[PDB]
């Protein structure tokens, strides 16, 4: 046992998770401008 | 199945977590757990997992079920594959026929044993009743009564109903059938009077006693009839199902049970991070290395010869870190020969303790429950005889020194070389057991104390080491203390012992000797400060037991003085064949009791080892009954 | 480690379901737009071509 190592890898998983999420978020905002300047 | 990568599981001490952490690591395996204190890198607990796990219990149960009523039951193996899902299928079918036929096993004894019972009051009281069991227009009540209620029935029949009705009775074992007939008006009356007497209608369960007696009689001995044969046909299913079928459930059987264990441990992992083992999931590639680096520890499930086969494991004990103290290894030769020292006897016992080992590591098939014992046949399982073949050859190794520690014995017993009395008496060799000389004796007793005066100083100084090496100045203070304590001992045994061999030469160093003494336990202080006088019956106990050692032994011997030599008749070479009759029962219950006597040895050994003189068992605590270790 | 490259490998491949799934969220809300547009323009081609026809018809008609 060496706490820190697998009780911190475990964590900079999660945040490229998260990262996945932001950039995805995103995608809907880019298709909600779309949505509105075609129509208008 | 558990993880891409399948899990290996090992388990020993807390000592051992570190150790079996370092060859793990290295061996190439992945998802290692015990590691730090909140892990939970790896794979976790699901509903899914649970919910195969119940299947494997299912899976388990039913194999050990329908092994239960069919007879016999399995043994543990290795996995066999066979999926889960098929493995409940296979399951099916086997346990759904075999239970048809428990039922009808059941069903059948049922049946006979009723009816042989009722076939005898049925057929008698039909007779008695025939007539009116064409169609009841007559109204009847069977029942049987021994003879004591015979005139209690009558009295109250004839009160109630006149004398209008018809009392008949026979005998035909099971009492007398007996039976009361009235009109179809009467009935109500008729009963009435039965009610009053004490006995009422006998009566069949379901259907057949309600029917009037000639249809129940005759139903009676259809089934009695019946039953035997059919349950001879269905046994036999039952027996080939097991011959065949017993195998399939086995395989299967032991399949679940490594799942189970595996997928439980699995859990463990997930989400508390496990307690003291260390556990990890392998890749095949590493599935070897885990095998091969392991320094004689832990305890897995995966998915001269006498000396060294105990050795070995005290080994996995000695690799352990938890003190720079040592443990109980040494121990095997202090114990062994004097263990096989304790036999001691002659020509009517030691010399014939020969016999006995051969039936251990062989057997003779005379022998009742020692049977084949080289494939093992016990009044207790054939497994834990074949487990005990290590054991069988050590008791057979204890049998050729036993019977050697017989001539051993016997180099006192005879001879004209030392004794002036024959070479070898002429009826039997030896009649009388030489050692009543008070200098005869004495050597043999002070031999005794020897090997234990040795063994006060094989605890004391492990126990100074316990507090040596760990700075427990309590622990030194105790061993060293206690070290003083035999000098005083030996001041005064001096001045009995040759009387005057010393008494004065250390006798007035006595003096200084209590100074030798007491000089640490007042360093620890101590409240049982009279805890020394014990100190001294340790010193003692040693010589003590050695001594009953011998006297216990000595009264073995005597035995052959009367139930061997000659006992019986003024002496002729007839007394041979005249003293066999009582002899050879006395001389089992005799054998019995110096089995007894090798635990005083062990016992002797357990006043040091289960009591901290440079050992971990205190009264118990973690570390195990270690005689039952060295055994093999 | 290997050990926490399986952890990794693992985190990459479901983030690269997410993002096209993402996208796909998107790429129908993208093309609804499209379809939905289409439908405005044509439909008041009709009702003005109406307004068209009708309108020189009656006027030649008077």
């Known amino acids: 046992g060496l706490i820190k190592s697998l009780a911190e890898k475990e964590k900079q998983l999660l945040e490229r998770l998260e990262a996945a999420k932001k950039e995805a978020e995103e995608r809907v905002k880019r298709a909600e401008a779309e949505a509105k300047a075609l129509l208008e | 199945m558990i993880a891409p990568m399948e899990k290996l599981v090992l388990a020993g001490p807390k000592g051992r977590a570190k150790e079996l952490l370092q060859s793990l690591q290295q061996a190439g395996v992945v998802h290692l757990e015990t590691l730090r204190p909140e892990a939970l890198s ?74 042989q019972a009722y076939l005898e009051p049925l057929e008698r009281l ?43 009775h026979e005998a035909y074992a099971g009492g007398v059938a007996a039976l009361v007939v009235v009109h179809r008006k009467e009935v109500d009356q008729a009963k009435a009077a039965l009610s009053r007497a004490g ?38 299913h039952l027996a080939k199902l097991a011959r065949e079928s017993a195998s399939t459930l086995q395989s299967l059987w032991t399949r679940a049970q490594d799942e189970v264990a595996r997928l439980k441990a699995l859990e463990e992992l997930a989400s508390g991070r496990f307690g003291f083992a260390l556990l990890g999931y392998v890749p095949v590639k590493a599935k070897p290395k885990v095998e091969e680096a392991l320094a004689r520890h832990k305890e897995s499930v995966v998915y001269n010869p006498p000396w060294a086969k105990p050795f070995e494991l005290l080994v996995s004990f000695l690799n352990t870190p938890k003190y720079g103290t040592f443990d109980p290894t040494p121990v095997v030769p202090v114990f062994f020969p004097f263990w096989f020292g304790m036999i001691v006897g002659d020509i009517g016992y030691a010399l014939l303790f020969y016999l006995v080992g051969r039936w251990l590591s062989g057997y003779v098939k005379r022998n009742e429950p020692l049977v084949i014992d080289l494939f093992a046949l016990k009044l ?79 605890g004391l100084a492990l126990r100074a080491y316990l507090g040596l090496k760990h700075r427990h100045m309590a622990h030194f203070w105790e061993g060293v203390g206690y070290l003083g304590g035999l000098v005083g001992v030996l001041a005064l045994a001096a001045s009995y012992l040759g009387n005057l061999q010393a008494g004065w030469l250390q006798g007035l160093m006595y003096l200084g000797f209590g100074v030798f003494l007491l000089a640490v336990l007042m360093s620890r202080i101590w409240l049982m400060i009279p805890e020394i006088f014990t100190q001294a019956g340790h010193i003692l106990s040693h010589i003590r037991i050695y001594a009953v050692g011998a006297a216990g032994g000595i009264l073995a011997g005597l035995l052959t003085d009367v139930g061997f030599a000659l006992a019986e008749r003024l002496g002729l070479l007839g007394v041979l064949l005249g003293l066999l009759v009582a002899g050879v029962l006395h001389l089992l219950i005799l054998l019995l009791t110096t089995l007894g006597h090798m635990l005083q040895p062990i016992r002797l050994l357990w006043v040091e080892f289960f009591t901290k003189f440079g050992f971990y068992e205190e009264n118990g605590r973690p570390y195990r009954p270690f005689k039952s270790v060295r055994e093999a | 480690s290997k050990l926490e490259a399986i952890l990794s490998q693992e985190v990459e491949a479901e983030i690269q379901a997410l993002l096209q799934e993402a996208e796909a969220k998107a790429e129908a809300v993208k093309r609804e737009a499209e379809e939905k547009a289409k439908a405005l323009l044509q439909a008041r081609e009709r009702a003005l071509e109406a307004q068209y026809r009708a309108a020189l018809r009656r006027a030649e008609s008077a």
């Not at chain 2, 009695?224 to 001879?232: C, D, G, K, M, Q």
């Not at chain 2, 016997?410 to 008070?438: K, M, N, S, Y």
Request: hydrophobic content about 50%; proline content about 6%.
């Open chain 2, 126 to 168: 039909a007779a008695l009743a025939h007539g009116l069991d064409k169609s009841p227009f007559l109204r009847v009540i069977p029942f049987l009564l021994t003879e004591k209620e015979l005139p209690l029935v009558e009295e109250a029949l004839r009160k109630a109903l006149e004398d209008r009705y018809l009392l008949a």
């Open chain 2, 42 to 115: 790896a794979y976790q607990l699901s509903p899914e997992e649970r919910a195969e796990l119940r299947r494997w219990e299912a899976v388990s149960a039913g194999a050990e079920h329908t092994l239960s009523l069919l007879g016999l039951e399995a043994e543990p193996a290795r996995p066999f594959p066979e999926g889960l899902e098929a493995a409940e299928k296979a399951l099916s079918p086997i346990q759904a026929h075999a239970e048809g036929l428990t039922r009808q096993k059941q069903e059948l004894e049922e049946e006979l044993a009723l009816a």
């Open chain 2, 199 to 236: 006995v009422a209608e006998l009566r069949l369960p379901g259907a057949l006693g309600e029917l009037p007696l000639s249809e129940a009689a005759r139903r009676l001995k259809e089934r009695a009839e019946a039953a035997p044969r059919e349950l001879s046909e269905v046994r036999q």
């Open chain 2, 380 to 458: 207790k399982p054939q497994v834990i005889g074949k487990l005990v073949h290590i054991l069988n050859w050590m008791v057979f190794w204890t049998v050729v020194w036993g019977v050697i520690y017989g001539e051993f014995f016997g180099t006192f017993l005879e001879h004209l070389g030392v004794f002036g009395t024959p070479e070898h008496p002429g009826l039997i060799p030896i009649l009388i057991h030489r050692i009543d000389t008070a200098k005869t004796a004495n050597l043999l007793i002070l031999l005794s104390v020897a090997f234990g005066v040795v063994l006060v100083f094989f």
